[PDB]
Structure formats: C-alpha cells, structure tokens
Design an enzyme around this catalytic site. Structure first.
Site, PDB file in Angstrom:
ATOM      1  N   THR A  10       0.828  -1.219   0.000  1.00  0.00           N
ATOM      2  CA  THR A  10       0.000   0.000   0.000  1.00  0.00           C
ATOM      3  C   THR A  10       0.861   1.268   0.000  1.00  0.00           C
ATOM      4  O   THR A  10       2.077   1.255   0.117  1.00  0.00           O
ATOM      5  CB  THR A  10      -0.928  -0.032   1.219  1.00  0.00           C
ATOM      6  N   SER A  79      -4.532  -3.086   1.025  1.00  0.00           N
ATOM      7  CA  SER A  79      -4.997  -1.726   1.308  1.00  0.00           C
ATOM      8  C   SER A  79      -5.116  -0.912   0.015  1.00  0.00           C
ATOM      9  O   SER A  79      -6.019  -1.237  -0.800  1.00  0.00           O
ATOM     10  CB  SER A  79      -4.125  -1.115   2.409  1.00  0.00           C
ATOM     11  N   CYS A  80      -4.353   0.128  -0.270  1.00  0.00           N
ATOM     12  CA  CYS A  80      -4.532   0.868  -1.505  1.00  0.00           C
ATOM     13  C   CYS A  80      -4.038   0.155  -2.753  1.00  0.00           C
ATOM     14  O   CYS A  80      -4.278   0.635  -3.876  1.00  0.00           O
ATOM     15  CB  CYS A  80      -3.917   2.248  -1.387  1.00  0.00           C
ATOM     16  N   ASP A 206     -10.273  -5.279  11.326  1.00  0.00           N
ATOM     17  CA  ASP A 206      -9.510  -4.192  10.748  1.00  0.00           C
ATOM     18  C   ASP A 206      -9.937  -2.846  11.332  1.00  0.00           C
ATOM     19  O   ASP A 206     -11.114  -2.507  11.251  1.00  0.00           O
ATOM     20  CB  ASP A 206      -9.704  -4.230   9.217  1.00  0.00           C
ATOM     21  N   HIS A 234      -5.306  -5.091  10.458  1.00  0.00           N
ATOM     22  CA  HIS A 234      -5.219  -4.671   9.048  1.00  0.00           C
ATOM     23  C   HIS A 234      -4.062  -5.360   8.336  1.00  0.00           C
ATOM     24  O   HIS A 234      -4.180  -5.736   7.153  1.00  0.00           O
ATOM     25  CB  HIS A 234      -5.122  -3.124   9.000  1.00  0.00           C
ATOM     26  N   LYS A 235      -2.927  -5.546   9.019  1.00  0.00           N
ATOM     27  CA  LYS A 235      -1.781  -6.192   8.406  1.00  0.00           C
ATOM     28  C   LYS A 235      -1.847  -7.704   8.580  1.00  0.00           C
ATOM     29  O   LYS A 235      -1.023  -8.322   9.261  1.00  0.00           O
ATOM     30  CB  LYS A 235      -0.452  -5.628   8.931  1.00  0.00           C
TER      31      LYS A 235
END
Lengths: 256, 256
Positions: A10, A79-80, A206, A234-235
C-alpha cells in the site's frame, strides 16, 4: 499447484511489508515477486516526482511487461494496492490469472476511479497524527501524507509485535492517494480490469478499513470469492501470515 | 541508569537492522536513535553520489551536531559502523560517553584508517556471490558492491529466521567500503577518537568477521572492556537481541 504471486504494498509502504509472507509462500513451492512501487521502499524516486496513481504503479507495469508470453501471475494487493491492480489489469489483463484483494480497496467499472477512496474518507475521516503537505506535478496540486506513528500503532499495526511496528516507523515514507487525480482519470475498463477474477480477503477486526467500508465494497462490486479471516488486524500478512498463505494456495489451485 | 543510544548500521544496511533491539532498549527506559547513513535504508541519496566514508557518515555527524550542550550519547556500531564511530569521535568527542563495537571494525590511531579493512580482506577474501562495480567521485575511482544473497544467507544471517533474511534481501542496497579513500585519509586522532571509552562485543560464531580477525583487532587496539556473546551469528542484534540489550544496560550503568 504452484503459482507466481506478485505482492503489491500500500501507499507509504514497500515490499518489506511482505517479509513474512514471501518465504512462507516459497515454502509451499510458489514463485514470489514483492515489488517496491515508485517512491516506495528502497525505490530511488521521491513522491514529489510522481504525478498520478498510474505513474506510482510504474514498477508493477514494467514487471508485467517483462513477463514472457504465456506466463500469468496472481496479483495480491494490500490496502490501496487494489488501485494498482486495476491500473495493471487495464494494460496486462491477459497476464493476470487472478487478483487477490487483502484488506484492499476494490475499484469498479461503473464509477470514477476515486469512488472507493472517496467512500473510505467518509468512513475513516480522522487519520490521527498523520501529516499532510502539498506539491505540484504536471500542473496539478497533489496532497502528500506521512502516516502518523499513533495511527500506525493503533489502526494499522494494532496486533503486530513491537519489532514489526518498529519496522513501520523506520521504513514508512511520504506518499499520496492521488485522490483528485483519480477523480479525473478515465474509468477502469470492463474488458480489462472488469474481466479479471477477483478474490476479496478481509478481517472485520480491521481498525482502518472498517467493516462498514469493506462490506460496502463487497456489495458495490461483487467479488468472485470472499474469504473472511478471523481475528488479526489490518496487516494480516503479519498477524495471520499462515492463514493468508493457505488462502493463496487455494486461489492458486482454483484460478490459472 | 538510562542512556541515549545511537545505533549505527553497517554498509549496505540501514536502521532497519535494529528493528528488534530498539524496542527492547526502549522497554528498559532508554532513548534510542537508529539512523540511516548516506545512501542507506530510506536515505534519498544513491551511493554514486558519495565520495568517502566521511561523506557516508553525514547523518551521524548531523545528528551529533544537533545535540544540545551537555547531552552525551552511547554510539553502537555494527560491522563497518566502527569506522563511522571513529569519524564521529574526531568531530564530537565531548558528546560521546562511550562507543560499543558490535562484531565491528575497530580502527586505531597508530595506523592508517584503512588498516583494519585491509586486514579484514586478508582474513575474508571471498565474498561469494557479491557483485562489484566502479564509479568516480571527486576524481577517485570507488569500488561499489552489492552483497550477494548467498553471502547474506550463509555468512551474515546464518542463524536468523527466514523473515529476517527476507528483509535483508529486500532492503540491502549498493554500498562501498571506500577502502582506497580510507587509505589516503588523515589518521584518526589520539585526542578525539583515541580518548573515547571503547567496549568490544563479539561472538566467535561470526561467519564473516571470523575469530582470527576479531581477536587480532582486540590485540591490536586494546578495548576498555570486552564482552563475548556465546552462540548467535554476525547479526547479534537479531539472534541475541536480549543479550545485547543486557550488555548495553551495563554499559549505560558504567560510562556516562
């Protein structure tokens, strides 16, 4: 079956985020490429040189260009990184066996490229101690950011070990969402990005890509398959590395 | 007692090598700074811009310059970082409470600055799959290197976990020993570098800085104190992190 996975970090991150997952996938027999995107990780460029999400994606596009005919990969974006996936799929769709979204943005073909970023910013408006700046490139004002260490600890690396959070403090760099550039970009295409198989992996625990956002994305643009990982943060490639590798093995056995 | 430790990586490495030690030292109550030297880690320069070990040391010198009067630090240098220590001590000796050498080169004041590097190259002449190149800076030809992945696995990260070796593959960069530039450099001074307290930490199980070399260095330039860590590998801050922190605590309690 074995696959060639291409792991895509990300914004503000680099290949280093994959340092646990890459050897685990290799221990299953896969080939793994973990790229630094432009101005990321140990890439030599600085973010102020980069004018769009497409330019940011150059190392991924260059890598895909270099694949000989007939070789397909499974993209994995965190993520992104889902935006990098969409960009890549509109150039090199024939080289993509599948795309796996890992607590990731899931762009669509019906709305403008910024659509899910705009939504993210509604669901998660307060980036805590993140700092912002502006720079100009190709006649546009771009908002840069540097992820705040409190945001990293509490929201991105919530359940990660202190030595993993330390790496993030050491290695995260200035980056950008290029939100306003995405808003003016031509739409992702149905023939290209819309045609690829899309596997959506997430956890409800998350703390930045919250459940309301992730479930909104799944409803907005139906994935081919959804995997929910219990627990973690999240990770997931740090907190649920084994579970992510098991999912990726099943994806390799399903899509080629 | 608490101290301010300044952790100094070796060539081709960055602050990231300290990602386990830094939080452990902080959990003892210390302040810790882990720097990227020039063209290292996420520093924006490339090695071909750097003409000497002194220029390579700029971030350390700049950091020391920024300490207010009266504040002293304990420098901790791994592998080639002992040369950065000597350079720093000849500018900012009054700011250095002690220097800790961590499987490190130990320059002296009686011989030229390249002396222990020249010896290292005699003891360990074969860097396996390491690659070399040349560049020119300030009218001199500099030998650059990129550490080979077999050398990393077998000799530097021998007993480290796969996720630590992975980080080294991802993050190690082109660097240089600047051996020929050191050979022409003015000697390290007795008043500056020679005056600082020097603590030598090592393991005999080191597979690149072999016992013959390390014991030769100790005989050549007697440290104020020697600590031998049993077991581990060259990267003691990864394989013996706890033991290194315990040693550093005792150094903080001894030298101020």
């Amino acid at each position: 079956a074995f696959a060639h996975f291409v792991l895509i970090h990300t914004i503000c991150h680099g290949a280093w985020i994959w340092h646990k997952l890459k050897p685990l996938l290799e221990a299953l027999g896969h080939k793994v490429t973990a790229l630094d995107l432009a101005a990321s990780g140990v890439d030599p460029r600085q973010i102020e040189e980069i004018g769009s999400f497409d330019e940011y994606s150059e190392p991924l596009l260059t890598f895909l260009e270099a694949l000989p005919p007939g070789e397909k990969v499974i993209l994995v974006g965190e993520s992104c990184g889902g935006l990098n996936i969409a960009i890549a799929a509109d150039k090199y769709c024939e080289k993509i066996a599948a795309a796996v979204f890992h607590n990731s943005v899931l762009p669509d073909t019906e709305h403008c490229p910024s659509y899910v970023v705009d939504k993210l910013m509604e669901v998660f408006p307060d980036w805590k101690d993140t700092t912002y700046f502006t720079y100009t490139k190709d006649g546009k004002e771009i908002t840069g950011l540097k992820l705040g260490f409190t945001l990293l600890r509490e929201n991105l690396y919530t359940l990660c070990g202190p030595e993993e959070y330390e790496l993030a403090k050491m290695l995260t760099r200035k980056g950008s969402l290029f939100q306003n550039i995405l808003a003016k970009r031509p739409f992702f295409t149905k023939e290209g990005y819309g045609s690829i198989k899309k596997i959506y992996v997430w956890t409800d625990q998350d703390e930045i890509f919250l459940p309301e956002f992730q479930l909104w994305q799944i409803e907005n643009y139906k994935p081919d398959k959804v995997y929910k990982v219990e627990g973690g943060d999240h990770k997931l490639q740090l907190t649920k590395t084994k579970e992510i590798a098991e999912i990726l093995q099943e994806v390799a056995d399903t899509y080629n």
